[PDB]
Design a protein around this ligand. Structure first.
Ligand SMILES: [Zn+2]
Ligand SMILES: [Zn+2]
Ligand SMILES: [Zn+2]
Lengths: 224, 83, 107, 145, 297, 98
C-alpha cells in the first residue's frame, strides 16, 4: 500500500517533488535537494563543547599577543601581529561561528552533533594531507584572506537551485544552510593553520573538491 | 512553450537518466549501421562506441527538459557537463 | 473577535457571517488559556501579502490548487485569522538543511 | 528521565526531570493544567496533535511516530523517505490514510482528464512513461557542425 | 500501411474523457443507418446503402470506402449513426440520472439547495468533483419541495427569495430501466395521504436536464463542454464500423427493428400504452446493447 | 514464480528504467497507426493519403491533424468506448489554450 500511494512522486527539473497532478509535495526534495546515496554522517563541531573550548579552537585575535596565530603556523605571522584590518575579518568569521553554534543548538535541542550531510570534509582534508605530503613543521603560506575569503566564496558556488529571482535565492540559501555551518566550522582559520596545516595549494584543492563533490550529491531530476 | 537559451535555470550537469538514454539511443543507431563520428580505435560494441562518442562530445543531440507547467529548456549534449 | 465562556446558541452563532466585509470570529476561552503557537511542534506560520502570494505563484509557476493546504479551521489558521485563498509561509527547522520553508493555502 | 541541556559553562549535561505518562488522552484539557509545561506536552496520538495544535504540528508528530516504529526494531532509514510519506499524508491539510467499465462511465460523466504520466496508461498507448529515463525528450541537434 | 503520412507524428500526452452529445455524433457520422441489413439490393448478395457499407468500413479487399480507400487493414473504421425515435436512458448512468433527479427540482430544473443553506455551502466548497456530488446529493435527496423563500444567513426574522417555483418533489425509485416517481402533500396528517405513483418518462427527465444551469450542473461535477447532464440520455447512437464487430450486429439489428416500429406507430396514431411499450423495448435493446459491449478485454 | 509482476515493476520504476518497462510490458499486438483531429482528439480523421487530403467532417478542419501510433488493442478499446457514447479524446499537447 505505501508503494501504491507514493509511486507517482518524482523529482522535477525545478528540484520540486510532485505528484502526477503536478501538485507540490515538497518545494525541494528532502528539504536539501540531495540524493540520499551521497550523504554521510558527519559531526558539526560548533555545536558541542564548552564555551571556553569553542573559543580556544576558533578565535583568532590578532591584536593580542596571547591569542594571535603563532608565526610558526603561518609565514605572514610576524607581519599580521597587530594588524587592524585583518582583525576585522577575523572578527566577522568568529561572529558567524557564534551564531552558527546558537542556530544549531536550536535545531538540535539535545546537542547531537552527528548528522548525515553530503561531502565528507574530514576525508577530503586527510586526502589533501597525503596528497601534498604536508609537513606539520613548516609555517604554511596561506594568508588570512586566502582562508577567510576563499571559504566565503565557496559558499556561493554550492548550488542546488539556480533561478535569478529572490524567492529561489532564499530557497537556495535555506537549502544549504546546515551544510554551510559544517563548512565554516571545519575550514575556519585557526583549524586550517593550526590543526590541518594546510598549504595554499592543498587548501585550494580542498575547496574545489568540496565543490565538485557537493555538486555531484544533488539529486537528479527524473528520480522516482 | 520554450525558454530562451539565457535565463535557463535547470542544472548544467547531465543526469544519470539523460546519460543512459543518450548512450542507449545512440548505440541503437550505431547498431543499425549508422555512421559514427568518432575514431574506432578498435571498439566493435555499440554502447562502447556511444560512450566514446559522449566523451569526445561528438553526439549531436538535444535534451528537451519539460518543467511541470508545460514550458521547456533545450540543452545540447555538447554543452551538458558530464560528471 | 468575541470570546465566550461556554457556548453560543444554535442561532446566535447564525448571526456571525452577517455584515460583509467585516468578519467576526469566535473563541471559547478555554481554547485560549494556552497559546498553541508557543508549542515546540508548531512552527512559525507567516501570512503572505497578496503580492507575496503573486510572486510565489509566478516563480514556481504554480496554480493555487498545486500548493499544499491548511484548512480554515486549523488551529493555527484560526489563530492568525486566515481567510480562504490566503497563503502562509511556514518556516521550519530541518535536520537535513537547517531551515526550510513550505507554504500552505487556506481552503 | 535524563534530559541533555546546556550547562552554565556551555557543555551539555544531564539533568533529570520527572515526567508523567498517561493511559488515555485528553490533550486540550490536560494542556491547561497549572504546573505543567504546555510547550513540551506530547502524545502518540497524532490525530489529537493535529486537532489541537494544527496540521504542521501533526505532520511533525506523525513523523516522529513513524520514526519511532522504525528505530524501536533497531534499524535506520534516511530522513527523507519518511519525510516524503508524512508530507503525502498531510498536504491536503488533514491526515489522509495511505492504505473497470463502471469507472470509465464515471470518467465520462465527470470529464476526467488523465495526465498520462503513469506507467500503465503509457503501456496501453505504446509509449514510455515520463519517469526516470523518460522525463525529457531527446531530439536531433540540427544547430551543430 | 508501410505508406506515407504528411501529418506530423506525436505521442499522446493527455486523454480527456466526456460524453458524446447527439450533435457531435450526427456531426462526425458518415452513414445514417435506417434499414437493419447486410447485402442483397431486393435480392443481390453484394452491398446496401443502409447498414454495413453505407460509407464505413469494408471486408472486400477493396481499398475503398468513400474516397478514404486504404486496405481492409490500415482503415481505422468509420463511424455510423442511427437517430432514435424516442430518447432512451444510457443504461450505464440510470443510477446517476436518478441521483441528479433527486438534487434538482423536477419542474424548473434548479438545484434544491443553494448558497443560502450553509450545510450546502460546505458541500459546495468541496474540490473533488466526486466527493462534491456525493455531498450535495446527501443534502438534497431529503428536500421534498422547491422553495420559494428561505431564511437567509443574517437576521432570521426575515426570509429572502430564491429562484422559487414551489413544487413538491417525487421520491424516485428504480424499477429496472424505468424510474418511478411518488409525490405526496405531507407524511400522513390531514390535507393528503396516499402518494401518486407515476413513471418518469425519459422525455421529461431529458427536458429537465436541458433546463439545469451551467453553474448548477458544474456544481454537480458535470462540464459545459465535455459532459452535460443531458448526454446521459441517448437520442443519437453511435454505430461502430466492422473493426469493432468479430455478433454485435445481430443486436443493433434488433435496435432498429424496435426503432422502426416505434416510429411506425407514432406515424399511424396509435394508443398511448402501445407507444410506451415499444419505447420500452427500444430501451431494453439499447441497454442490452451495452450491458454486449462490456466486451472490452 | 518466473514473472514480472507489480513488485518487479516497482523496482524498475525506482531505478528509472522506463525503456525497459515499456519493452517488457508491451504487447507484440502491433503498432497500428491512426490520424487524430487536434481540436476534438478523436480518431475521426478521413485520410486520403494518395491525394494528400486529411478532413475532420464535423470539426470542419483539414489543418490541425496528427498521426499517432498505438497498439491495435487500444484503437479497439477506444472505438468500443465511442460505441458506448464515451469520448476518449487524445491530445498531443499538455498545457492547453492556457
Ligand atoms: Zn476508411
Ligand atoms: Zn422548482
Ligand atoms: Zn475534430
Amino acid at each position: 500500500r505505501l508503494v501504491k500511494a507514493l509511486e507517482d512522486i518524482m523529482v522535477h527539473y525545478d528540484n520540486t517533488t510532485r505528484n502526477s497532478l503536478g501538485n507540490v509535495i515538497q518545494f525541494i526534495y528532502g528539504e536539501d535537494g540531495m540524493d540520499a546515496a551521497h550523504i554521510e554522517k558527519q559531526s558539526l563541531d560548533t555545536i558541542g563543547g564548552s564555551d571556553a573550548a569553542f573559543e580556544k579552537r576558533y578565535r583568532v585575535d590578532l591584536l593580542n599577543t596571547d591569542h594571535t596565530l603563532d608565526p610558526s603556523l603561518l609565514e605572514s605571522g610576524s607581519e599580521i601581529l597587530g594588524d587592524l584590518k585583518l582583525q576585522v575579518l577575523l572578527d566577522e568569521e568568529y561572529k558567524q561561528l557564534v551564531k552558527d553554534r546558537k542556530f544549531l543548538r536550536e535545531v538540535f535541542v539535545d546537542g547531537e552533533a552527528n548528522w548525515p550531510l553530503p561531502v565528507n570534509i574530514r576525508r577530503i582534508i586527510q586526502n589533501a594531507q597525503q596528497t601534498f605530503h604536508i609537513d606539520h613543521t613548516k609555517p604554511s603560506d596561506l594568508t588570512i584572506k586566502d582562508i577567510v575569503l576563499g571559504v566565503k566564496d565557496l559558499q556561493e558556488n554550492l548550488l542546488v537551485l539556480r533561478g535569478k529571482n529572490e524567492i529561489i535565492q532564499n530557497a537556495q540559501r535555506d537549502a544549504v544552510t546546515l551544510f554551510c555551518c559544517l563548512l565554516r566550522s571545519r575550514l575556519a582559520t585557526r583549524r586550517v593553520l593550526q590543526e590541518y596545516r594546510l598549504t595554499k595549494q592543498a587548501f585550494d584543492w580542498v575547496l574545489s573538491n568540496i565543490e565538485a563533490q557537493f555538486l555531484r550529491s544533488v539529486v537528479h531530476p527524473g528520480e522516482m | 512553450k520554450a525558454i530562451p537559451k539565457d535565463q535557463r535555470a535547470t542544472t548544467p550537469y547531465m543526469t544519470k537518466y539523460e546519460r543512459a538514454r543518450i548512450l542507449g539511443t545512440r548505440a541503437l543507431q550505431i547498431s543499425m549501421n549508422a555512421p559514427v563520428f568518432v575514431d574506432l580505435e578498435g571498439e566493435t560494441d555499440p554502447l562502447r562506441i556511444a560512450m566514446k562518442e559522449l566523451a569526445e562530445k561528438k553526439i549531436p543531440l538535444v535534451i528537451r527538459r519539460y518543467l511541470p507547467d508545460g514550458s521547456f529548456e533545450d540543452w545540447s549534449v555538447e554543452e551538458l557537463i558530464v560528471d | 473577535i468575541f470570546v465566550y465562556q461556554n457556548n453560543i446558541t444554535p442561532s446566535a452563532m447564525k448571526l456571525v457571517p452577517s455584515i460583509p466585509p467585516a468578519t467576526i470570529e469566535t473563541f471559547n476561552e478555554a481554547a485560549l488559556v494556552v497559546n498553541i503557537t508557543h508549542h515546540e511542534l508548531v512552527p512559525k506560520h507567516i501570512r503572505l501579502s497578496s503580492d507575496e502570494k503573486r510572486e510565489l505563484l509566478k516563480r514556481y509557476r504554480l496554480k493555487e490548487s498545486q500548493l499544499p493546504r491548511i484548512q480554515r479551521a486549523d488551529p493555527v489558521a484560526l489563530y492568525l485569522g486566515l481567510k480562504r485563498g490566503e497563503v502562509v509561509k511556514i518556516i521550519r527547522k530541518s535536520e537535513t538543511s537547517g531551515r526550510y520553508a513550505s507554504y500552505r493555502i487556506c481552503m | 528521565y535524563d534530559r541533555k541541556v546546556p550547562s552554565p559553562t556551555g557543555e551539555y549535561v544531564k539533568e533529570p526531570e520527572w515526567v508523567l505518562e498517561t493511559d488515555g488522552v485528553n490533550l486540550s484539557e490536560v494542556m491547561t493544567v497549572p504546573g505543567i509545561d504546555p510547550t513540551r506536552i506530547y502524545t502518540n496520538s497524532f490525530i489529537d496533535i493535529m486537532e489541537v495544535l494544527g496540521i504542521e504540528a501533526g505532520r511533525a508528530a506523525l513523523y516522529k511516530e513513524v520514526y519511532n516504529v522504525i528505530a524501536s526494531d533497531g534499524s535506520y532509514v534516511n530522513y527523507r523517505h519518511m519525510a516524503l510519506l508524512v508530507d503525502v499524508m498531510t498536504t491536503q491539510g488533514g491526515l489522509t490514510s495511505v492504505t473497470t467499465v463502471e469507472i470509465l462511465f464515471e470518467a465520462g460523466a465527470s470529464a476526467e482528464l488523465d495526465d498520462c504520466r503513469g506507467v500503465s496508461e503509457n503501456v496501453i498507448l505504446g509509449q514510455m512513461a515520463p519517469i526516470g529515463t523518460g522525463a525529457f525528450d531527446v531530439m536531433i541537434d540540427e544547430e551543430s557542425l | 500501411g508501410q505508406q506515407y503520412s504528411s501529418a506530423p507524428l506525436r505521442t499522446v500526452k493527455e486523454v480527456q474523457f466526456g460524453l458524446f452529445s447527439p450533435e457531435e455524433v450526427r456531426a462526425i457520422s458518415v452513414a445514417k443507418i435506417r434499414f437493419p441489413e447486410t447485402m442483397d439490393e431486393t435480392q443481390t448478395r453484394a452491398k446496401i446503402g443502409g447498414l454495413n457499407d453505407p460509407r464505413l468500413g469494408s471486408i472486400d479487399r477493396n481499398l475503398k470506402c468513400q474516397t478514404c480507400q486504404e486496405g481492409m487493414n490500415e482503415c481505422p473504421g468509420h463511424f455510423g449513426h442511427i437517430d432514435l425515435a424516442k430518447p432512451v436512458f444510457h443504461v450505464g448512468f440510470i443510477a446517476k440520472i436518478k441521483k441528479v433527479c433527486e438534487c434538482v427540482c423536477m419542474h424548473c430544473g434548479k438545484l434544491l439547495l443553494d448558497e443560502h443553506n450553509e450545510l450546502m455551502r460546505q458541500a459546495l466548497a468541496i474540490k473533488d468533483s466526486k466527493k462534491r456530488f456525493a455531498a450535495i446529493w446527501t443534502l438534497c435527496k431529503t428536500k421534498m419541495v422547491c422553495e420559494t423563500d428561505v431564511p437567509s444567513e443574517d437576521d432570521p426574522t426575515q426570509l429572502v427569495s430564491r429562484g422559487g417555483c414551489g413544487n413538491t418533489q417525487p421520491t424516485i425509485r428504480k424499477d429496472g430501466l424505468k424510474l418511478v416517481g411518488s409525490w405526496k402533500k405531507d407524511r400522513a396528517t390531514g390535507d393528503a395521504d396516499e402518494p401518486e405513483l407515476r413513471v418518469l418518462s425519459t422525455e421529461e427527465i431529458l427536458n429537465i436536464f436541458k433546463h439545469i444551469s451551467v453553474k448548477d450542473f458544474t456544481s454537480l461535477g458535470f462540464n459545459e463542454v465535455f459532459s452535460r447532464p443531458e448526454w446521459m440520455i441517448l437520442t443519437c447512437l453511435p454505430v461502430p464500423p466492422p473493426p469493432v464487430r468479430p455478433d454485435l450486429t445481430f443486436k443493433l439489428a434488433d435496435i432498429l427493428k424496435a426503432n422502426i416500429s416505434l416510429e411506425t406507430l407514432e406515424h399511424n396514431g396509435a394508443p398511448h400504452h402501445a407507444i410506451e411499450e415499444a419505447e420500452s423495448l427500444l430501451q431494453f435493446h439499447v441497454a442490452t446493447y451495452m450491458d454486449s459491449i462490456r466486451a472490452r478485454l | 514464480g518466473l514473472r514480472f509482476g507489480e513488485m518487479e515493476r516497482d523496482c524498475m520504476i525506482a531505478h528509472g528504467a522506463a525503456s525497459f518497462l515499456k519493452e517488457r510490458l508491451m504487447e507484440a499486438s502491433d503498432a497500428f497507426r491512426v490520424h487524430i483531429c487536434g481540436i476534438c482528439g478523436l480518431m475521426t480523421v478521413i485520410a486520403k493519403l494518395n491525394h494528400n487530403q486529411f478532413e475532420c467532417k464535423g470539426c470542419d478542419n483539414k489543418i490541425d491533424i496528427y498521426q499517432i501510433h498505438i497498439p491495435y488493442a487500444a484503437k479497439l478499446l477506444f472505438q468500443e468506448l465511442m460505441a458506448m457514447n464515451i469520448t476518449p479524446r487524445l491530445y498531443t499537447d499538455r498545457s492547453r489554450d492556457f
